[PDB]
Amino acid sequence: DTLNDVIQDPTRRNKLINDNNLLKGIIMGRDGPVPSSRELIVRPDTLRAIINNRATIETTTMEAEFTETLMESNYNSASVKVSAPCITANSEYSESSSFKNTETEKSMYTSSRYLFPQGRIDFTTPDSGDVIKLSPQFTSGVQAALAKATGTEKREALQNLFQEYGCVFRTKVHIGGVLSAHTMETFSRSENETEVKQDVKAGLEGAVKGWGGGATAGHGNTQGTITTSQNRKLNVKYIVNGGDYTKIQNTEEWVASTNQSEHWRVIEVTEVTAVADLLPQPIRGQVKDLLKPLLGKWVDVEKVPGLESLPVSVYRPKGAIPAGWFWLGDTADASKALLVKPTLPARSGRNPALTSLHQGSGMTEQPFVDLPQYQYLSTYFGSFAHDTPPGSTLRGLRPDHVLPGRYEMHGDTISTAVYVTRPVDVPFPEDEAFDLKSLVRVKLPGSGNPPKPRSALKKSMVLFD
Ligand SMILES: [Cl-]
Ligand SMILES: [Cl-]
Ligand SMILES: [Cl-]
Ligand SMILES: [Cl-]
Ligand SMILES: [Cl-]
Ligand SMILES: [Cl-]
């Protein structure tokens, strides 16, 4: 009946907590977001709730790759944001993804959800408050991991802990029923981004409005095609959550079932908190430091010879590179270069932080990532070979490690012109990036060259001292 009653009655409420896995952390993987089999927090006898019967249509637009299953799970932008690094790191990479970001093309996900809510449930973060308590078993696993003797053993234990419990926990969820449509769009960079985003959003919102309004043929989960006002053909995935699915073929009956508590499910993930952030200091900081996939070391550099025609000097770390450490590309930094070292051992099924590189088969001397979808920061000034220094110690990066950078172009002629990559200079960045002055050649000879880097390394991924 009413949501307020549910929270009161322990049996109605526990069915709500259990059927929706509200105590479970979320595991990100190749198939998407999966509830842990273990409970992460202590079960409360009552839930913080905010009543809302107001049906609305919301729309989320997303340019971040690897987030499609989260979009289909009705995560909002903020929830996708927090969850992005985890799912990116745990995704199954491939060279043949329909999602494509190139020099000419750009892709994005758009999801529209017709909500039929009953309210929103919030789990208070430690800053009370109603405050949640981490499970004794979980906080035990943490203590045990931190009690290990060597760094690797500590980190390896933390990974198992998080692989088991999950990387994020849903701290705010809406419940009820939902009819949602999800699509991906790939478009030329020569198009107006605003126009494409509004055009897709309008077409997708119109589709779900007709669905939940009862003006279109009723239907459950299925795939289809819609056409925008600008004649864009979109492949759409329709998803239903909550309510009685046996009644979905008749939309209005479906909507009526939304008022039945037995059929309420999560219809939107509104806020997500990284599990580690549920920890009190200084345990929180110890874990997060250990979780960092790379160690960092600033070393001196040396100018590269053969680059007198170039508008700037090119620098590489001064040999010899300490064994087990790697560099990330030619820089214009004459003072220091960053070396990195992976903190986690390579294991089958695990996406390593770094990838080695190999020279292209075509008419190019530029490196290509061995591992699909991995990224590097600089063009290679010279001829790359994986078996010869310094290319032998050069490494690419797992996609979660990088953000888009920005070019500062130098040169009086294109053929010698270079881009110097800086962190993006938006005033309030969510993820802070290293300034590495990664060097990118403006025009490369000749086609067969890999896509041009414009990336910056996240500081949150590198552990110092
Ligand atoms: Cl899914
Ligand atoms: Cl709570
Ligand atoms: Cl469901
Ligand atoms: Cl190749
Ligand atoms: Cl690249
Ligand atoms: Cl840019």
Residue numbers in the entry: 53 to 181, 184 to 519
Paper passage:
To gain further insight into the structural conversions in pore formation, we chose pleurotolysin (Ply), a MACPF protein consisting of two components, PlyA and PlyB, from Pleurotus ostreatus. Previous studies have shown that PlyA binds membranes and is required to recruit the pore-forming MACPF protein PlyB to the membrane surface. PlyA and PlyB together form relatively small and regular pores in liposomes. The membrane attack complex/perforin-like family (MACPF) proteins form the largest superfamily of pore-forming proteins identified to date.
To probe the mechanism of pore assembly, we engineered a series of disulphide bonds to limit movement in either TMH1 or TMH2. As performed for perfringolysin O and other CDCs, the TMH regions were trapped by introducing cross-links to the central sheet or other adjacent regions in the monomer structure. This trapping allows oligomer assembly but prevents the TMH region from unfolding enough to insert into the membrane. The disulphide trap mutants were engineered on a background PlyB variant that lacks the wild type cysteine (C487A) in order to avoid incorrect disulphide bond formation. Oxidised TMH1 variant PlyBF138C,H221C (TMH1 lock) possessed no detectable lytic activity, but reduction of the disulphide restored wild type lytic activity. The crystal structure of the TMH1 trapped variant was determined and is otherwise indistinguishable from the wild type.
